[PDB]
Structure 1
């Protein structure tokens, strides 16, 4: 059931902004590890005395990395005279965020028809305001409301190139890396209590619950009208034999925040070959692979969607597989992106639900919790 109850018109995920201590080193690491091109900048070289922001792109996926300069560089500025390209930025907030949570996502940004309207309707419907709507160079409007923890949902709308005051980066400085990643599929938050978080977010967005099909968590997924903006939320379950990884997140993160970003690839096998080649030379590591029993058991569950070669090519790369009543999902998870066991990345590819592919085809891998358990015990014997 899709009641299509969005309270304002939502388009697609627009970008994800990381708040960093040094944006240069995180951005260069991510570019190599994920195969994303440097495409725009806003920093001292573009007149920004407030923050350094570097934009990486791969297909429609946009990763923004932002860090504060010394406040002394802009101590004479006021908001009307600011040189910041992102008017919501605040030195204090950024330093406080990074010292509290370490490296992670500050903004989940979605493009909307009218960011001023989205903001007004959101806060009229219970959203906690974070940064009021601001029109940038009469062309782009940005607004922000609290999402969970210190993460904001950022609305961006365009009258008619990332943001004004960002410059396209020099072709010499911009190497065309590409490992097949194409867009953000979903963005997942961890919270102490799922109910109140769901009530808050669905309350001010009108996003509806996306239908699904002992592991220490409960979750639900909020979706926009066409189900292309997908926001799962996890809560821990206490008392289990193995401590809830959601609780471990909340402790190391100092509370609620973004748990993982799921990046759709147009060829997950090429992506995983390319990322795994770079794991030990500056890229990302991957979760330990499932046992061979998991891949032995894949014939019975998806033998009609994947060939024997494609299945064995999953086992080489550690890829996980799950299936809906509509489609099939291939997924794999990185180790944490930084020092703390908090944010990680998911690479996914969806098979089926062709009408274009409808959003969320195949689900989010719920069945793989039960299946991973079965396979580790089967394999032991």
Structure 2
């Protein structure tokens, strides 16, 4: 059923709470092909919080830290989670309706709709509490023509190394995954259905995604127009500990496990990301032998050179109409929590259990190296 009013247009931005915003922004710019977009801090009159905002295509990351000793909210979050996603922002139409509807359905409103303004126009915001300590910020632009948002100025520094690095060709945020503790997948996903009038887009249980040792369950929620997709995972039974449970152990609770970034040229993207020193998960040579064999009878034709995919360790999955190319980075911090994915879609707007399985297996290999694939 189509929601009466309101519309979630798309992912607006992801906000990270990190120990060192300056160095985090440098990491994402140099290693992942982002560029400075905006800044707030002591020099712009923001005296409690510093934010470095960076962008690639439509992808916008906000890296924020506390400026003062003993910041309780940001300090606690940092100690509990380490560097990680705090907020997922959605650009919306009719923020007021969305908030009112969410409130009536029982969502916790961390911040009532307020409006900010600069010379480029007005923006209305609201903040809702989702799983764990993660929030959603709703962004409604009211004839706003700025490059980002009110309260942020031009970048503090334009790193002269950046233009000398190869372009990574990342275009937009494709989906964002939230890991939940044991038995909280349903309640976490229902939150979207009930409060935001999302619907169930896809799901897998532990009989569809598992290795010889561990498994998960997942439900993907999506907005009506399906421009926003968010897999919600929980651990599931196995001889050994699910990687979802490893996440929860190290995150101290529910939170965002990965952000997938879409590209229209994944060969170029991964080659350039590797040249910049980004690390990715690995896949055995046998996978590509089996892949070539399977493609002989497939209804689709993969256009990327398989040798290149194999070289770059890109995973392939397909249905009868199209295919998906996906790859995970290693975690972007030392705790095995947050990582990133690069995805290219070819006439395929969903997810594939094939890739979900291979990715799950590729990640479980690293969980084992961390000594956390332990018997249950």
Question: What range is the shorter-chain TM-score in?
Answer: 0.7 to 0.9
In 2, the alpha carbon distance for the partners of 1:373 and 1:106 equals: 24
Distance apart, 1:242 and its partner CA:
2.6
Q: Does 1:306 align with 2:302?
A: yes
Distance apart, 1:270 and its partner CA:
0.8
Q: Does 1:184 align with 2:173?
A: yes
Greater mean deviation of Cα atoms: 251-260 or 113-122: 113-122
Partner of 1:39: 37
Partner of 2:354: 367
Compared CA separation, residues 173 and 369, structure 1 to 2 (3 A): closer
In 2, the alpha carbon distance for the partners of 1:71 and 1:370 equals: 44
CA contact (8 A) 1:8 1:121 kept: no
3-state SS of paired residue (1:167): coil
Q: Does 1:142 align with 2:125?
A: yes
In 2, the alpha carbon distance for the partners of 1:7 and 1:218 equals: 32
Compared CA separation, residues 374 and 345, structure 1 to 2 (3 A): closer
Partner of 1:358: none
- After the TM superposition, which residues 136-175 of structure 1 pair with which residues of structure 2 at under 5 Å, given as runs? 136-137=116-117, 139-160=122-143, 161=146, 162-169=148-155, 172-173=158-159, 175=162
Q: Does 1:233 align with 2:232?
A: yes
Q: Does 1:69 align with 2:67?
A: yes
3-state SS of paired residue (2:130): strand
In 1, the alpha carbon distance for the partners of 2:54 and 2:358 equals: 35
Match for residue 324 of structure 1 among 305, 319, 322: 319
Query: Unaligned 5+ residue runs, structure 1?
Result: 73-90, 354-360, 376-381
3-state SS of paired residue (2:305): helix
Q: Deviations over 1:191-244 (max 9, x none)?
A: 122111122221101001114695210001111121110111001013x12310
CA contact (8 A) 2:328 2:359 kept: no
Tell me which stretches of 4 or more aligned residues in structure 1 moved more than 6 Å: 372-375
In 2, the alpha carbon distance for the partners of 1:241 and 1:263 equals: 32
CA contact (8 A) 1:6 1:225 kept: no
- After the TM superposition, which residues 6-85 of structure 1 pair with which residues of structure 2 at under 5 Å, given as runs? 8-70=6-68
Partner of 1:75: none
CA contact (8 A) 2:51 2:65 kept: yes
Q: Deviations over 1:31-58 (max 9, x none)?
A: 1111011111111121111111011111
Compared CA separation, residues 172 and 64, structure 1 to 2 (3 A): closer
Q: Deviations over 1:316-342 (max 9, x none)?
A: 000001113442100000111112001
Q: Deviations over 1:94-117 (max 9, x none)?
A: 111111111100001000012233
Greater mean deviation of Cα atoms: 153-162 or 125-134: 125-134
In 2, the alpha carbon distance for the partners of 1:237 and 1:167 equals: 46
Greater mean deviation of Cα atoms: 259-268 or 138-147: 138-147
CA contact (8 A) 1:7 1:206 kept: no
Compared CA separation, residues 370 and 150, structure 1 to 2 (3 A): closer
Q: Aligned residues, how many? A: 340
Greater mean deviation of Cα atoms: 189-198 or 172-181: 172-181
In 1, the alpha carbon distance for the partners of 2:158 and 2:274 equals: 26
In 2, the alpha carbon distance for the partners of 1:349 and 1:211 equals: 19
Distance apart, 1:364 and its partner CA:
2.6
Compared CA separation, residues 122 and 340, structure 1 to 2 (3 A): same
3-state SS of paired residue (1:29): helix
CA contact (8 A) 1:333 1:347 kept: yes
Q: Does 1:127 align with 2:107?
A: yes
Partner of 2:369: none
In 2, the alpha carbon distance for the partners of 1:257 and 1:372 equals: 19
CA contact (8 A) 1:36 1:58 kept: yes
CA RMSD of aligned residues (A): 2.3
In 2, the alpha carbon distance for the partners of 1:172 and 1:129 equals: 37
Partner of 1:243: 241
